[PDB]
């Protein structure tokens, strides 16, 4: 499922991501855009048994268990295929786990390199939410 930017934004606001740990809502939408292109079923095979999953591309070596990755930690205590869903509750709950403080968004390489410092609010402006 590929979300429209406003739809994704309203979903994320519903799940408490707006101003979560001081991160404005646009940060989250921008990160989704660059990580999975808003596709809830995105997957990405890394150079190590690792694989990134769903809309926020959560890693199988540290956050969700796929049981196919050399050394899971499953810190989110969730199966990676839970992340590959139309409903974003799991992805969001794990993301909140990942972002423990105000610098937590660095968890997403695309956000740090393509969102941090830009007008991320641009992604949600004009969205009814």
């Amino acid at each position, epitope marked *: 499922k590929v979300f429209g930017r406003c739809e994704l934004a309203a979903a994320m606001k519903r799940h408490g991501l707006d101003n979560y740990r*001081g991160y404005s809502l646009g940060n989250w939408v921008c990160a989704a855009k660059f990580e999975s292109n808003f596709n809830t079923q995105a997957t990405n095979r890394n150079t190590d048994g690792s694989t990134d999953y769903g809309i926020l591309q959560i890693n199988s070596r540290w956050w969700c268990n796929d049981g196919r990755t050399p050394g899971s930690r499953n810190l989110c205590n969730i199966p990676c295929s839970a992340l590959l869903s139309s409903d974003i509750t799991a992805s969001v709950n794990c993301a909140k786990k990942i972002v423990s403080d105000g610098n937590g968004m660095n968890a997403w390489v695309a956000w740090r390199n393509r969102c*941090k*410092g830009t007008d991320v609010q641009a992604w949600i402006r004009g969205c009814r939410l």
Partner: antibody
Amino acid sequence: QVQLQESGPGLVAPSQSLSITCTVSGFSLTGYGVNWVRQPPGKGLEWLGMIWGDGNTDYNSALKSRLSISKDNSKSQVFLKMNSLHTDDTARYYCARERDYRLDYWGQGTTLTVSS
Amino acid sequence: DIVLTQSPASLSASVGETVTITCRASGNIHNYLAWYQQKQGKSPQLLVYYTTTLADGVPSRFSGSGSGTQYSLKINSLQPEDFGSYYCQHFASTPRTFGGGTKLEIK
């Protein structure tokens, strides 16, 4: 440690330009915007413009034509270039860092006076 | 431009008193509103951002509330170091603008 330090000419006339410099430290310009704000004597704050981490710029609509903001990421410096000076440009000029829609760190401000 | 109407212009209060400073936006700013305090001859200092979030280090006697177009900064039991000026600024789009300021002074 996050630091913003402004350096300007101090006094200028309606016939020259005006370039104020904002030398930052403790953070990369690629990751944050820097806004320029001024405060006329005994007056409130006035927003001038800003440059985002990506180099895009936005300006106060009224002063947009007299302003130009640029930066050198490697020198950790941001520049406010202003022309067509008026005596109403006399103010304390501040560069402030923008971190996700709030100005969290402000420089000390440089006082500029526009003469005849 | 979205303009902000801040009031009152000046406030005379005693320590221990509670005071409210409002800022009304000419347009909906969607909660992107910050408050700053500027003390005699100092740069402004961030107090509150996104309407309600205190900045790090800011005492909890400061609380912001708002939504839509009317915003308030409340200071409960004001302390000697609270006097000075306060400004609101929006971040709803560019250009950003500030409120005219409120001078909080000793009764």
